[PDB]
Design a protein around this ligand. Structure first.
Ligand code: HEC
Ligand code: HEC
Lengths: 108, 294
């Protein structure tokens, strides 16, 4: 994978600032603006029950991994056109590596 | 005698490409300095900057307005209602150093235009030609709106900016951006979950969130939600007024309508008090960094 590795500590601060307002990560995490991200890796897009996805998010049907997640978090609406995730994007490779590293631990 | 007339004077030898480079300079630093204000970015404060430098205008005598760029003087710089905008000026300072030919007015308003577009907002036409004016032209403090009022105050205040009911509801949607800081305004919290991407969230959250009037740690009163969002007393007065309410519901279901209406009212705000000659260049519409392949 072209995804190296970052700091799970930096990723933690990156998630609480740029992700937490819409996403929870722990098991039994409540569906807010965005769906609960627990176990998001190893799962196709738009398949967490209880949450109401867009049709484009479901039809994307992408098996999430560290690599396609990097594409998605760079520019959410270009990787998946029609998505309702209002997010500018992680335009820095370090922030991507740092956050994905944190998410992997949190999504366990 | 007739009051002052501010004629748009194009920067000597400058055209669209030159101003596009200033746009890119602002847009790039927006990406680099992405960790500001807990990763909110310099976006919101830059449009707040453009609004406060244009919101000093008085239609009755054409005093104030963004033309003079008089915010560069201490009298306006240290306005109690302008607390926190120093971060915005400091942001544009290296950009002004890189393009010393641009006027302060043109630079401040362009910063306003640039971040809205970069935050995936609507395209906002922008016109150059503003000219710096002496320190004596700097308007007195107290020309900026008060947060702890009602709908009647808001409508009356914006009469001085030649804004109508439809114009102020669209402009107020910018309060979905960033947040209020206690050490700046005396109010605390964001207005939604998405405050660095330009959407119609301000109108949705105003209608779909349950608000309760409380008292924060600065003894001031603000509307708070269970989700953790906040609204100023003036913001909340938009769903209190039946005419404002109708327009709020409109922009809530139609972000497209909101974008086009904001783009109009925002440009008019930045150009209030400026006379554009017949020979003046048509308004500029700069392509985003994303539209530049970045
Ligand atoms: C709201 C303000 C959000 C912010 C900030 C972030 N996300 Fe998001 N996310 C949000 C929504 C509304 C949606 C659904 C979009 C749709 O079209 O249905 C999502 C989706 C995701 C997903 C995909 C989930 C799945 O396919 O099951 C992921 C992996 C995700 N979001 C992650 C994520 C990260 C890492 C963020 C910040 C660093 C982030 N999101 C921001 C809402 C919002
Ligand atoms: C077109 C844009 C625009 C208009 C018009 C506008 N605002 Fe705002 N204002 C902003 C933005 C953007 C912020 C957030 C700044 C930030 O996040 O740094 C803000 C922040 C504020 C703050 C808090 C600033 C701080 O740093 O704590 C107050 C108080 C405020 N606005 C009051 C008002 C009132 C009252 C009105 C009208 C009656 C008004 N504004 C109209 C854009 C606008």
């Amino acid at each position: 994978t072209e995804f190296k590795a970052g700091s799970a500590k930096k990723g933690a601060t990156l998630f609480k600032t740029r992700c937490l307002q819409c996403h929870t990560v722990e098991k039994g995490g409540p569906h807010k603006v965005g769906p609960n991200l627990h176990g998001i890796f190893g799962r196709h897009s738009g398949q967490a029950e209880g949450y109401s996805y867009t049709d484009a998010n479901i039809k994307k049907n992408v098996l999430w991994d560290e690599n396609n997640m990097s594409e998605y978090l760079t520019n959410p609406k270009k990787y998946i056109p029609g998505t309702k995730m209002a997010f500018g994007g992680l335009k820095k490779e370090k922030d991507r590596n740092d956050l994905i590293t944190y998410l992997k631990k949190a999504c366990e | 005698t007739t009051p002052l007339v501010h004629v748009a004077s194009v920067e000597k030898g400058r055209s669209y490409e030159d101003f596009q480079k200033v746009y890119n300079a602002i847009a790039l630093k927006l990406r680099e300095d992405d960790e500001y204000d807990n990763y909110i970015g310099y976006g919101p404060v830059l449009v707040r900057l453009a609004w406060h430098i244009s919101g000093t205008w008085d239609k009755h005598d054409n005093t104030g307005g963004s033309y003079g760029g008089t915010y560069r003087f201490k009298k306006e710089f240290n306005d109690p209602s302008n607390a926190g905008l120093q971060n915005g000026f400091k942001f544009l300072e290296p950009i002004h150093k890189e393009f010393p030919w641009i006027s302060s007015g043109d630079l401040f308003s362009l910063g306003g235009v640039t971040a809205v577009q970069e935050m995936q907002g609507p395209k906002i036409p922008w016109r150059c030609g503003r000219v710096d004016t002496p320190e004596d032209t700097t308007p007195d403090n107290g020309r900026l709106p008060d947060a702890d009022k009602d709908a009647g105050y808001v409508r009356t205040f914006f009469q001085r900016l030649n804004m109508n009911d439809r114009e102020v509801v669209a402009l107020m949607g910018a309060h979905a951006l960033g947040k209020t800081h206690l050490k700046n305004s005396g109010y605390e919290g964001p207005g939604g979950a998405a405050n660095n991407v330009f959407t119609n969230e301000f109108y949705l959250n105003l209608l779909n969130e349950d608000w309760k009037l409380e008292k924060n740690d600065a003894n001031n009163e603000q509307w708070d939600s269970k989700s953790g969002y906040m609204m100023l007393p003036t913001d909340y007065s938009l769903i209190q007024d039946p005419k404002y309410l109708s327009i709020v519901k409109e922009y809530a279901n139609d972000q497209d309508k909101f974008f086009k209406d904001f783009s109009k009212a925002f440009e008019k705000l930045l150009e209030n008090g400026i006379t554009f000659p017949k020979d003046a260049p048509s308004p500029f519409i700069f392509k985003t960094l994303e539209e530049q392949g970045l």
